[PDB]
Design a protein around this nucleic acid. Structure first.
Ligand code: MG
Ligand code: MG
Ligand code: MG
Ligand code: MG
Ligand code: MG
Ligand code: MG
Ligand code: MG
Ligand code: MG
Ligand code: MG
Ligand code: MG
Ligand code: MG
Ligand code: MG
Ligand code: MG
Ligand code: MG
Ligand code: MG
Ligand code: MG
Ligand code: MG
Ligand code: MG
Ligand code: MG
Ligand code: MG
Ligand code: MG
Ligand code: MG
Ligand code: MG
Ligand code: MG
Ligand code: MG
Ligand code: MG
Ligand code: MG
Lengths: 129, 80, 32, 156, 82, 205, 123
RNA sequence: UACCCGCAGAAGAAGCACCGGCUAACUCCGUGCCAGCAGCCGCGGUAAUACGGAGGGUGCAAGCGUUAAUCGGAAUUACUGGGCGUAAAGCGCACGCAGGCGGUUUGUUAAGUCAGAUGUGAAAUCCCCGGGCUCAACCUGGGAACUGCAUCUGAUACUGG
RNA sequence: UUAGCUAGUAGGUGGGGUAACGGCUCACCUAGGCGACGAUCCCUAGCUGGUCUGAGAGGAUGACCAGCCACACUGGAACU
């Protein structure tokens, strides 16, 4: 069955990147939307568009620079089977600072750097290189 | 402002007494999975108010028996 | 006990390993 | 101005009606002491010839590697066949902490500071390839910025 | 009872003493309640040989603790210095 | 605890001039500096990756006159300290009292300097120091004591030094026979041929 | 492999037994030469390798190789064994120490003397 | 006693292992599957850089080798960090209790989670900056650390109720 | 390749006992209590601060120094 939605989304994104797809649609969720927004902010996707009332579809628009993909790698870190929380000192540096680590904090989802700045840790959703 | 634990009542057969399983959601040392570990406690209760499968709040006290060193403070959700 | 003496592994028919013929091939020489 | 290291020379055989026909493979690598590195694998009936061939091969099909100062830009993993190979940038003065074939490639490339482990196989040919792959994939900060539509300041 | 006393902690022939509040029954270098200073007899020029956390000592005394003769002497010296 | 044997042999083995002799007479005249020692000198085997590193390590150790355990300790210390490891190690080596003396020019050779140190000749901030391994800090004046000031060897050493290239990081007086260790030397002040990095690598396998 | 699985039943460390168990984690042991005899090695080698069956101090009857050119050991000769197994020999897991207890040093030996219990020659 | 000053004279003071590859260091002589070596691969059957001796070298050095034992290398029990079509590895197939995991929205709670504070986490040891023995080891002042536990006050994205 | 174990056993009442709570103990009443989150049984072992190793996470260990425990020819017992 479907157990992780965030993970699924990530996978979809990865596959889109692989297959040189312009856009990647999926069922929406709030967390997912937040993640997408974060990605956009960080500059790994062009745009995201949530669309529908009853059952709304998120639709990301993947980014390609000089032929190849932008989202070079993208892993789920915490996952339902085995969660990962991190205190603000323990927050990771993905690709030695070049990549980002999406982290859910009490003041919302944000990139690792942002979290650090704030002075708070949290659940580490995904790494994006 | 007293240290008090919640838990379900596993059994209430022995008189003026109950046994209360207290669940705790500890992280594993090595693997980092979060396990539900369980702590059965023999708790004293005068009047025998608690039924089985009943959620109940308990505090630590001086020992009332061999195995019994906790006393209940209130009952919650006693539905059957 | 002469027959037993002859039997001992000490006096088993040795055969010298080849260097150029059949068992010639050595994977690694005595020195590099 | 191109330093060149012969990593390994290895004797290989092809059996025929007569007997064994031996031959020698030679795995070399060359680099300029900056980004550019190339490995060559040359085979011949005699060793020197093979080595020469390898060198020639190396000299064409080079590859550039973004080097932040004397070291890598971020920790990188490279794999190829059996060898899978971790290499992590390091502080000035640590030297090339790496094993054998991997070391040689690094040295020519002009990385002076690395901590590098080879897991899996250590088949020199494969390991060097893996290392090269790792180097190749590794992106600089500037490149990343370009990709993402940001300034290097914004990323840090 | 609780006493304030020295606790030999140094090398051979170069003793450095630690002053400590401690139950009298315990061994010299063993268990102690609080380390309230130190004393160094093999101290060079231009360095503090002795140093007592005086307030703590006072508190201990108030509580009802004895003071070793040497410790008392040290205290006196400190006072003089002050 | 010291190498007492032939000095030029070591140099030969290394390849280079290790300055294990006073420098009156050119090293080529005293020995076949190119040809390695022993019966199998003329043969030059292709040296391994480990081997080159080892050789390098030896060279440095030989130069300063330091046995292995001590060297290891020094390396460890360097590692512990902040900044580039090899450089740190080099600095530490330099800092040795005997080495400093040699640099100043009170010993013709490093060995000579060491001997002098041993034989209670070298005061460091007015206190006689006998340990060759003593680390001379910045702004530590280091001098010949009045008893050893008359020795003809010392003046010879000084003369020799005067012919040699002077180090920037010290400041020495020939008349007063006393020198100030002004600062720990930068890598650029020392010899370029020493591949400290190799040494560092070696102590990580 | 699965984290849950691991939790249920964790990972077993491969317990490696000793190859010199008659020592009982001692660097040497004393024993008496129950018998002393030659043995042929396995292929490809050829020799009459000198070995002694040795009743050790701790009860164990082992068989110990005797190194060096020549030896003095008889029956009832007290010797010190040290661990080390001859490869060509089946069943030998120990060397005699030469130069300890009754086992004598090797005669006329001038290199690796210490390994063969030989004192430095005076001249 | 430490320490210092004087006296005489190079005087009283260097060994151990190794040199086939791994592994830094090679030649001659004797023996000839013997004698012996060996950590692994192996060497030795008359030109042995592998045995024994010598000369020569290499590495350590008042120590140097061997043995034992532990971690390392071993991502070779893999949490970090492995695998299972053919190399060892998918229950013969299902149902299914316990257990694990659980789509989406809003509210609430605040158990997990995160933040801050308080108490504690002995001293020593480790690490950082210093000081003291001529240096060092050693001794030592101050810090940091002791990744934890408990409590109190918040945060509420994520998980839980 | 140890799966069942326990009748002062688990709880209650009331006496007695303790410096003190308490099946600590006794009398009566109830029939419980523990256990696959490994009870019971068997083998091994003093525990910790630490030490060694390791990039770490881990692994191994617990001489010396310091904290705690237990023991004092073996098995009991009390007295002060
Ligand atoms: Mg393999
Ligand atoms: Mg010494
Ligand atoms: Mg350093
Ligand atoms: Mg060699
Ligand atoms: Mg030998
Ligand atoms: Mg002959
Ligand atoms: Mg011969
Ligand atoms: Mg032959
Ligand atoms: Mg030989
Ligand atoms: Mg091992
Ligand atoms: Mg391991
Ligand atoms: Mg495997
Ligand atoms: Mg098969
Ligand atoms: Mg199979
Ligand atoms: Mg099947
Ligand atoms: Mg959910
Ligand atoms: Mg909470
Ligand atoms: Mg907190
Ligand atoms: Mg502490
Ligand atoms: Mg000092
Ligand atoms: Mg909820
Ligand atoms: Mg919620
Ligand atoms: Mg009662
Ligand atoms: Mg009563
Ligand atoms: Mg490891
Ligand atoms: Mg006795
Ligand atoms: Mg008794």
């Amino acid at each position: 069955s479907m157990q992780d939605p965030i993970a699924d989304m990530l996978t979809r994104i990865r596959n889109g990147q692989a297959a040189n797809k312009a856009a990647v649609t999926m069922p929406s969720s709030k967390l997912k939307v937040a993640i997408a927004n974060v990605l956009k902010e960080e500059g790994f996707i062009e745009d995201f568009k949530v669309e529908g009332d009853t059952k709304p579809e998120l639709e990301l628009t993947l980014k390609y620079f000089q032929g190849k993909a932008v989202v070079e790698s993208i892993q789920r870190v915490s996952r339902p089977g085995l969660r990962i929380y991190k205190r603000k000192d323990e927050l990771p540096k993905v690709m030695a600072g070049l990549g980002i680590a999406v982290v859910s904090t009490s003041k919302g989802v944000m990139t690792d750097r942002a979290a650090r700045q704030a002075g708070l840790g949290g659940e580490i959703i995904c790494y994006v290189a | 402002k007293i240290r008090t634990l919640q838990g379900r009542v596993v059994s209430d057969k022995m008189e003026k007494s109950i046994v209360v399983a207290i669940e705790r959601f500890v992280k594993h040392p090595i693997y980092g999975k979060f396990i539900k570990r369980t702590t059965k406690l023999h708790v004293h209760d005068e009047n025998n108010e608690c039924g089985i499968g009943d959620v109940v709040e308990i505090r630590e006290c001086r020992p009332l028996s061999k195995t019994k060193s906790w006393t209940l403070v209130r009952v919650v959700e006693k539905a059957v | 006990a002469i027959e037993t003496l002859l039997h001992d592994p000490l006096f088993r028919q040795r055969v010298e390993k080849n260097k150029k013929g059949k068992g010639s091939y050595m994977r690694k020489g005595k020195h590099g | 101005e191109l330093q060149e290291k012969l990593i390994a020379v290895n004797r290989v055989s092809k059996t025929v009606k007569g007997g064994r026909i031996f031959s020698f493979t030679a795995l070399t690598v060359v680099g300029d002491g900056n980004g550019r590195v190339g490995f060559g694998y040359g085979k011949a009936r005699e060793v020197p010839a093979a080595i020469q061939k390898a060198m020639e091969k190396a000299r064409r099909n080079m590859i550039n590697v973004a080097l932040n100062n004397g070291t890598l830009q971020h920790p990188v993993k490279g794999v190829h066949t059996g060898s899978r190979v971790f290499m992590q940038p390091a502080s000035e003065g640590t030297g090339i902490i790496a094993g054998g074939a991997m070391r040689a490639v690094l040295e020519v490339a002009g990385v002076h500071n690395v901590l590098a482990k080879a897991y899996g196989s250590t088949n020199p040919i494969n390991v060097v390839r893996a290392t090269i792959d790792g180097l190749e994939n590794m992106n600089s900060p500037e490149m990343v910025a370009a990709k993402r539509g940001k300034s290097v300041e914004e990323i840090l | 009872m609780v006493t304030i006393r020295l606790a030999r902690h140094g090398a051979k022939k170069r003793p450095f003493y630690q002053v400590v509040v401690a139950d009298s029954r315990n061994a010299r270098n063993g268990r102690f309640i609080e380390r309230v200073g130190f004393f160094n007899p093999i101290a060079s020029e231009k360095e503090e040989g002795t140093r007592l956390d005086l307030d703590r000592i006072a508190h201990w005394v108030g509580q009802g603790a004895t003071i070793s003769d040497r410790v008392a002497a040290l205290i006196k010296e400190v006072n003089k210095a002050a | 605890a010291r190498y007492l044997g032939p000095k030029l042999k070591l140099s030969r083995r290394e390849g280079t001039d290790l300055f294990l002799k006073s420098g009156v007479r050119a090293i080529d005249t005293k020995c076949k500096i190119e040809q390695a020692p022993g019966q199998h000198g003329a043969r030059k085997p292709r040296l391994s990756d480990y081997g080159v590193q080892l050789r390098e390590k030896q060279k440095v150790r030989r130069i300063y006159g330091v046995l292995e355990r001590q060297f290891r300790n020094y390396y460890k210390e360097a590692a512990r300290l902040k900044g580039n490891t090899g450089e740190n190690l080099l600095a530490l080596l330099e800092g040795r009292l005997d080495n400093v003396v040699y640099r100043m020019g009170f010993g013709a050779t490093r060995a000579e300097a060491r001997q002098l140190v041993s034989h209670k000749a070298i005061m460091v901030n007015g206190r006689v120091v006998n340990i060759a391994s003593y680390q001379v800090s910045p702004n530590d004046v280091v001098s010949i004591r009045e008893k050893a000031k008359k020795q003809s060897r010392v003046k010879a050493a000084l003369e020799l030094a005067e012919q040699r290239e002077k180090p920037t990081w010290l400041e020495v007086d020939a008349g007063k026979m006393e020198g100030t260790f002004k600062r720990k030397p930068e890598r650029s002040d020392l010899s370029a041929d020493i591949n400290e990095h190799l040494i560092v690598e070696l102590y990580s396998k | 492999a699965t984290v849950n699985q691991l939790v249920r039943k964790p990972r077993a460390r491969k317990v490696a037994k000793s190859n010199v168990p008659a020592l009982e984690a001692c660097p040497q042991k004393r024993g008496v030469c129950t018998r002393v005899y030659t043995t042929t090695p396995k292929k490809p080698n050829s020799a009459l390798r000198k070995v002694c069956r040795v009743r050790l101090t701790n009860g164990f009857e082992v068989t110990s190789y005797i190194g060096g050119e020549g030896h003095n050991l008889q029956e009832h000769s007290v010797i010190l064994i040290r661990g080390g197994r001859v490869k060509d020999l089946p069943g030998v897991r120990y060397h005699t120490v030469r130069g300890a207890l009754d086992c004598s040093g090797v005669k006329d030996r001038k290199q690796a003397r210490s390994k063969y219990g030989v004192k430095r020659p005076k001249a």
